[PDB]
Amino acid sequence: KMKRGINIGNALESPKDFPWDVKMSNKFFDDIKDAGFDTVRIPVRFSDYTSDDNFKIDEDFFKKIDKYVDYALDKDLIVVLDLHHFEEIMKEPRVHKEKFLKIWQQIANRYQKYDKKLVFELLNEPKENLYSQLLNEYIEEAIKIIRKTNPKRTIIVGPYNFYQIDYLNELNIPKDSNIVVSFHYYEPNDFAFQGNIYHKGFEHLSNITWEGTNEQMDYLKKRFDTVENWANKNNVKIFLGEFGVTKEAPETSRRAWVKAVREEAEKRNFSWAYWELASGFGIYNQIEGTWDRDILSALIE
Ligand SMILES: [Ca+2]
Numbered sequence: 327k328m329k330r331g332i333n334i335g336n337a338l339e340s341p342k343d344f345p346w347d348v349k350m351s352n353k354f355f356d357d358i359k360d361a362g363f364d365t366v367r368i369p370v371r372f373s374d375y376t377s378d379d380n381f382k383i384d385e386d387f388f389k390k391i392d393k394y395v396d397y398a399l400d401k402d403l404i405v406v407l408d409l410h411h412f413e414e415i416m417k418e419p420r421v422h423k424e425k426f427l428k429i430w431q432q433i434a435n436r437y438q439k440y441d442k443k444l445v446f447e448l449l450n451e452p453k454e455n456l457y458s459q460l461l462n463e464y465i466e467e468a469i470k471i472i473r474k475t476n477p478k479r480t481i482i483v484g485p486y487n488f489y490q491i492d493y494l495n496e497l498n499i500p501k502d503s504n505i506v507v508s509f510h511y512y513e514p515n516d517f518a519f520q521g522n523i524y525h526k527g528f529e530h531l532s533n534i535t536w537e538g539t540n541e542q543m544d545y546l547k548k549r550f551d552t553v554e555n556w557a558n559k560n561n562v563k564i565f566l567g568e569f570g571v572t573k574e575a576p577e578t579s580r581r582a583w584v585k586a587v588r589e590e591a592e593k594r595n596f597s598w599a600y601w602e603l604a605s606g607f608g609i610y611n612q613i614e615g616t617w618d619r620d621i622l623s624a625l626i627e
Contacts, residue, residue: 327443328404328506329592330626331365331599332358333568335607336524338391339369339410348605348612350390355398357615358603362626366403367567367599368394369410369450372429373422381428388436399441406482406567406599407433408447416454423464430468438475446472447482447567451489451510458486458496469500482565484508489567491549494556506597507560509553510568511587513546518583521574522606536579538586546590554594566591570601573608577620585624600625 334354336346358366370391375384391407398405409429415422430448437444448468452461465483472481481504485493489510497507512518520531536542557564569587571580584600591598604612609621 328365328565328597330363331367331406331597332363333367333369333599333602335369335602336605337369339371341371342374348603350394352394352397353615354603355401355403357610359401359403361617361622364404365406365597365599366398367406367408369408371411372409373412373414373425376425376429381425383429383432395444399443404443404445406445406447408450410450412449416452416456419456419460419464426464427468427471431471434472434475442479445480445482446476447508452484452486453488458493461486462498466500469502478504480504480506482506482508482567484567491552494553499560499562505562506565507557507562508565508567511566512569513549517575517579518571520572522572524606533576535576536583538582543586546586550590550594564596566596566598568599568601570607572606581620581624584621588625
Protein backbone atom coordinates (compact mmCIF):
# COMPACT_ATOMS: atom_id res chain seq x y z
CA LYS A 327 0.00 0.00 0.00
CA MET A 328 2.54 2.58 1.16
CA LYS A 329 4.90 3.72 -1.59
CA ARG A 330 4.98 7.41 -2.56
CA GLY A 331 4.62 9.74 0.42
CA ILE A 332 5.42 13.32 1.38
CA ASN A 333 5.93 15.08 4.71
CA ILE A 334 3.91 18.12 5.76
CA GLY A 335 6.87 19.44 7.69
CA ASN A 336 7.48 22.52 9.82
CA ALA A 337 3.76 22.61 10.59
CA LEU A 338 2.21 20.69 13.52
CA GLU A 339 5.65 19.72 14.90
CA SER A 340 6.34 23.39 15.69
CA PRO A 341 6.68 24.46 19.32
CA LYS A 342 3.31 25.26 20.95
CA ASP A 343 3.95 29.06 21.14
CA PHE A 344 6.09 29.52 18.04
CA PRO A 345 4.43 28.20 14.89
CA TRP A 346 6.71 27.67 11.93
CA ASP A 347 6.34 28.72 8.30
CA VAL A 348 3.79 26.13 7.09
CA LYS A 349 0.13 26.38 8.12
CA MET A 350 -1.66 23.03 7.87
CA SER A 351 -4.56 23.13 5.42
CA ASN A 352 -6.97 20.56 4.02
CA LYS A 353 -6.20 21.77 0.49
CA PHE A 354 -2.75 20.23 0.98
CA PHE A 355 -4.31 16.77 1.06
CA ASP A 356 -6.28 17.42 -2.14
CA ASP A 357 -3.12 18.45 -3.99
CA ILE A 358 -0.99 15.72 -2.38
CA LYS A 359 -3.52 13.13 -3.55
CA ASP A 360 -3.88 14.58 -7.05
CA ALA A 361 -0.09 14.64 -7.52
CA GLY A 362 0.18 10.85 -7.24
CA PHE A 363 1.24 10.41 -3.61
CA ASP A 364 -0.47 7.59 -1.71
CA THR A 365 0.96 8.45 1.73
CA VAL A 366 1.16 11.63 3.80
CA ARG A 367 3.36 11.91 6.90
CA ILE A 368 2.16 14.36 9.55
CA PRO A 369 4.74 15.29 12.21
CA VAL A 370 2.99 16.31 15.44
CA ARG A 371 4.70 17.59 18.60
CA PHE A 372 2.11 16.24 21.03
CA SER A 373 4.68 16.68 23.81
CA ASP A 374 4.08 20.45 23.79
CA TYR A 375 0.34 20.06 24.53
CA THR A 376 0.19 17.82 27.61
CA SER A 377 -0.75 18.33 31.21
CA ASP A 378 2.73 18.77 32.66
CA ASP A 379 -0.55 15.02 36.06
CA ASN A 380 -1.89 12.43 33.59
CA PHE A 381 -0.21 14.18 30.63
CA LYS A 382 -3.60 14.84 29.02
CA ILE A 383 -3.21 16.15 25.48
CA ASP A 384 -4.92 19.50 24.98
CA GLU A 385 -8.36 18.55 23.69
CA ASP A 386 -8.59 21.69 21.54
CA PHE A 387 -5.32 20.74 19.85
CA PHE A 388 -6.46 17.11 19.63
CA LYS A 389 -9.61 18.20 17.79
CA LYS A 390 -7.35 19.99 15.31
CA ILE A 391 -5.53 16.70 14.71
CA ASP A 392 -8.93 15.06 14.21
CA LYS A 393 -9.70 17.69 11.57
CA TYR A 394 -6.73 17.01 9.31
CA VAL A 395 -6.51 13.24 9.86
CA ASP A 396 -10.19 12.80 9.02
CA TYR A 397 -9.91 14.94 5.88
CA ALA A 398 -6.73 13.23 4.68
CA LEU A 399 -8.11 9.75 5.35
CA ASP A 400 -11.37 10.67 3.61
CA LYS A 401 -9.27 11.35 0.49
CA ASP A 402 -8.04 7.72 0.59
CA LEU A 403 -4.56 8.81 1.72
CA ILE A 404 -2.44 6.69 4.03
CA VAL A 405 -1.72 8.87 7.07
CA VAL A 406 1.38 8.42 9.22
CA LEU A 407 0.76 10.05 12.60
CA ASP A 408 4.28 10.88 13.76
CA LEU A 409 5.22 11.86 17.33
CA HIS A 410 7.78 14.48 16.32
CA HIS A 411 10.24 16.66 18.24
CA PHE A 412 9.75 15.12 21.69
CA GLU A 413 12.85 16.96 22.85
CA GLU A 414 12.88 16.45 26.62
CA ILE A 415 12.76 12.66 26.37
CA MET A 416 16.00 12.83 24.36
CA LYS A 417 17.68 14.75 27.19
CA GLU A 418 16.30 12.87 30.22
CA PRO A 419 14.48 9.78 28.90
CA ARG A 420 13.80 8.25 32.32
CA VAL A 421 12.05 11.42 33.51
CA HIS A 422 9.68 11.41 30.52
CA LYS A 423 9.08 7.69 29.92
CA GLU A 424 5.64 7.80 31.54
CA LYS A 425 4.61 10.91 29.60
CA PHE A 426 5.65 9.04 26.45
CA LEU A 427 3.50 6.02 27.32
CA LYS A 428 0.44 8.04 28.36
CA ILE A 429 0.64 10.18 25.21
CA TRP A 430 0.35 7.05 23.09
CA GLN A 431 -2.35 5.60 25.34
CA GLN A 432 -4.55 8.58 24.45
CA ILE A 433 -3.72 8.41 20.73
CA ALA A 434 -4.42 4.67 20.64
CA ASN A 435 -7.74 5.02 22.48
CA ARG A 436 -8.88 8.08 20.51
CA TYR A 437 -8.23 6.58 17.04
CA GLN A 438 -8.76 2.88 17.75
CA LYS A 439 -11.75 2.61 15.38
CA TYR A 440 -10.11 4.60 12.57
CA ASP A 441 -9.48 3.19 9.11
CA LYS A 442 -6.50 0.90 8.59
CA LYS A 443 -4.94 3.69 6.50
CA LEU A 444 -4.01 5.54 9.71
CA VAL A 445 -0.51 4.52 10.82
CA PHE A 446 1.26 5.14 14.13
CA GLU A 447 4.89 6.28 14.30
CA LEU A 448 6.01 6.12 17.91
CA LEU A 449 8.94 8.53 18.21
CA ASN A 450 10.74 10.40 15.43
CA GLU A 451 14.55 10.31 15.41
CA PRO A 452 15.52 9.13 18.90
CA LYS A 453 18.80 10.79 19.82
CA GLU A 454 21.10 11.99 22.60
CA ASN A 455 20.42 10.14 25.89
CA LEU A 456 17.55 7.91 24.66
CA TYR A 457 20.04 5.29 23.55
CA SER A 458 19.02 1.94 22.11
CA GLN A 459 18.70 -0.08 25.32
CA LEU A 460 16.21 2.46 26.68
CA LEU A 461 14.67 3.10 23.25
CA ASN A 462 13.90 -0.59 22.73
CA GLU A 463 12.45 -0.86 26.24
CA TYR A 464 10.12 2.10 25.68
CA ILE A 465 9.05 0.93 22.21
CA GLU A 466 8.08 -2.49 23.56
CA GLU A 467 5.98 -0.95 26.34
CA ALA A 468 4.33 1.53 23.96
CA ILE A 469 3.46 -1.19 21.44
CA LYS A 470 1.82 -3.33 24.13
CA ILE A 471 -0.32 -0.37 25.22
CA ILE A 472 -1.39 0.45 21.66
CA ARG A 473 -2.12 -3.20 20.87
CA LYS A 474 -4.76 -3.33 23.63
CA THR A 475 -7.02 -1.28 21.32
CA ASN A 476 -5.22 -1.40 17.93
CA PRO A 477 -4.16 -5.05 17.61
CA LYS A 478 -3.43 -4.64 13.90
CA ARG A 479 -2.73 -0.95 13.01
CA THR A 480 0.64 -0.53 11.34
CA ILE A 481 3.27 0.79 13.76
CA ILE A 482 6.49 2.43 12.56
CA VAL A 483 9.65 2.32 14.68
CA GLY A 484 13.15 3.58 13.99
CA PRO A 485 16.74 3.23 15.19
CA TYR A 486 18.78 5.46 17.46
CA ASN A 487 20.71 8.56 16.35
CA PHE A 488 18.16 10.24 14.09
CA TYR A 489 16.77 7.06 12.49
CA GLN A 490 20.30 6.29 11.32
CA ILE A 491 21.22 3.30 9.16
CA ASP A 492 24.24 2.62 11.39
CA TYR A 493 22.00 1.89 14.41
CA LEU A 494 19.54 -0.55 12.84
CA ASN A 495 21.58 -3.40 14.34
CA GLU A 496 20.72 -2.14 17.83
CA LEU A 497 16.96 -1.83 17.13
CA ASN A 498 15.06 -4.79 18.57
CA ILE A 499 12.35 -5.80 16.10
CA PRO A 500 9.13 -6.48 18.04
CA LYS A 501 7.55 -9.89 17.54
CA ASP A 502 4.59 -8.18 15.87
CA SER A 503 3.69 -8.71 12.22
CA ASN A 504 2.26 -5.20 11.70
CA ILE A 505 5.42 -3.14 12.28
CA VAL A 506 7.31 -1.06 9.72
CA VAL A 507 10.93 -0.06 10.38
CA SER A 508 11.93 3.42 9.24
CA PHE A 509 15.21 5.16 8.48
CA HIS A 510 15.98 8.68 7.30
CA TYR A 511 18.53 9.48 4.59
CA TYR A 512 20.22 12.85 4.02
CA GLU A 513 23.63 11.69 2.80
CA PRO A 514 25.93 13.55 2.38
CA ASN A 515 24.73 15.86 5.16
CA ASP A 516 26.40 19.01 3.85
CA PHE A 517 24.80 18.73 0.41
CA ALA A 518 21.30 17.88 1.63
CA PHE A 519 21.10 20.44 4.46
CA GLN A 520 23.02 23.33 2.88
CA GLY A 521 21.56 26.71 3.78
CA ASN A 522 18.76 25.53 6.08
CA ILE A 523 18.36 27.48 9.31
CA TYR A 524 16.52 24.62 11.05
CA HIS A 525 19.74 22.58 10.80
CA LYS A 526 22.34 23.49 13.41
CA GLY A 527 25.75 23.91 11.73
CA PHE A 528 24.54 23.77 8.11
CA GLU A 529 23.00 27.22 7.57
CA HIS A 530 26.19 28.74 6.10
CA LEU A 531 27.09 26.01 3.60
CA SER A 532 26.90 27.27 0.03
CA ASN A 533 26.90 25.86 -3.50
CA ILE A 534 27.62 22.19 -2.73
CA THR A 535 27.01 19.92 -5.71
CA TRP A 536 25.90 16.31 -6.10
CA GLU A 537 26.66 15.23 -9.67
CA GLY A 538 25.87 11.52 -9.31
CA THR A 539 29.45 10.41 -9.93
CA ASN A 540 30.35 6.71 -9.77
CA GLU A 541 31.61 6.93 -6.19
CA GLN A 542 28.60 9.04 -5.23
CA MET A 543 26.27 6.42 -6.72
CA ASP A 544 28.35 3.61 -5.21
CA TYR A 545 28.11 5.20 -1.76
CA LEU A 546 24.32 5.59 -1.93
CA LYS A 547 23.89 1.97 -3.09
CA LYS A 548 26.18 0.58 -0.40
CA ARG A 549 24.25 2.40 2.33
CA PHE A 550 20.94 1.04 1.02
CA ASP A 551 22.54 -2.41 0.85
CA THR A 552 23.05 -2.21 4.62
CA VAL A 553 19.36 -1.52 5.24
CA GLU A 554 18.13 -4.16 2.79
CA ASN A 555 20.42 -6.84 4.25
CA TRP A 556 19.22 -5.93 7.74
CA ALA A 557 15.61 -5.96 6.52
CA ASN A 558 16.10 -9.31 4.77
CA LYS A 559 17.44 -10.98 7.92
CA ASN A 560 14.74 -9.59 10.23
CA ASN A 561 11.76 -9.95 7.84
CA VAL A 562 10.34 -6.43 7.93
CA LYS A 563 9.24 -3.78 5.45
CA ILE A 564 11.29 -0.59 5.34
CA PHE A 565 9.94 2.97 5.17
CA LEU A 566 12.34 5.74 4.12
CA GLY A 567 10.35 8.23 6.16
CA GLU A 568 12.47 11.28 5.36
CA PHE A 569 14.75 12.30 2.51
CA GLY A 570 15.13 15.62 0.75
CA VAL A 571 17.32 18.55 -0.22
CA THR A 572 17.08 22.22 0.71
CA LYS A 573 15.91 24.76 -1.84
CA GLU A 574 19.28 26.52 -1.52
CA ALA A 575 21.08 23.64 -3.26
CA PRO A 576 22.06 23.81 -6.94
CA GLU A 577 18.98 22.99 -9.02
CA THR A 578 20.49 20.20 -11.12
CA SER A 579 22.12 18.43 -8.17
CA ARG A 580 18.99 18.69 -6.01
CA ARG A 581 16.90 16.99 -8.69
CA ALA A 582 19.55 14.36 -9.43
CA TRP A 583 20.01 13.50 -5.74
CA VAL A 584 16.27 13.25 -5.10
CA LYS A 585 15.82 11.20 -8.27
CA ALA A 586 18.60 8.77 -7.34
CA VAL A 587 17.51 8.34 -3.71
CA ARG A 588 13.87 7.75 -4.67
CA GLU A 589 14.94 5.25 -7.33
CA GLU A 590 17.15 3.34 -4.88
CA ALA A 591 14.29 3.14 -2.38
CA GLU A 592 11.86 1.72 -4.94
CA LYS A 593 14.47 -0.61 -6.44
CA ARG A 594 14.73 -2.32 -3.03
CA ASN A 595 10.98 -2.21 -2.23
CA PHE A 596 11.28 0.62 0.29
CA SER A 597 8.30 2.85 0.82
CA TRP A 598 9.36 6.48 0.99
CA ALA A 599 8.19 9.94 2.03
CA TYR A 600 9.85 13.04 0.59
CA TRP A 601 11.02 15.41 3.29
CA GLU A 602 8.86 18.32 3.15
CA LEU A 603 5.99 19.74 1.09
CA ALA A 604 6.14 23.54 1.36
CA SER A 605 9.00 24.64 3.64
CA GLY A 606 12.77 25.07 3.22
CA PHE A 607 12.92 21.63 1.60
CA GLY A 608 9.61 22.10 -0.17
CA ILE A 609 8.54 21.35 -3.73
CA TYR A 610 5.06 22.84 -3.36
CA ASN A 611 3.86 26.45 -3.14
CA GLN A 612 1.36 26.69 -0.29
CA ILE A 613 0.05 30.06 -1.53
CA GLU A 614 -0.55 29.06 -5.18
CA GLY A 615 -0.90 25.30 -4.67
CA THR A 616 1.55 24.64 -7.52
CA TRP A 617 4.26 21.98 -7.66
CA ASP A 618 7.94 22.21 -8.56
CA ARG A 619 7.75 20.08 -11.71
CA ASP A 620 11.52 19.55 -11.68
CA ILE A 621 11.61 17.78 -8.31
CA LEU A 622 8.12 16.27 -8.56
CA SER A 623 9.23 14.51 -11.75
CA ALA A 624 12.16 13.08 -9.79
CA LEU A 625 9.72 11.57 -7.26
CA ILE A 626 6.75 10.57 -9.45
CA GLU A 627 7.20 9.85 -13.16
CA1 LIG B 1 22.52 15.47 12.31
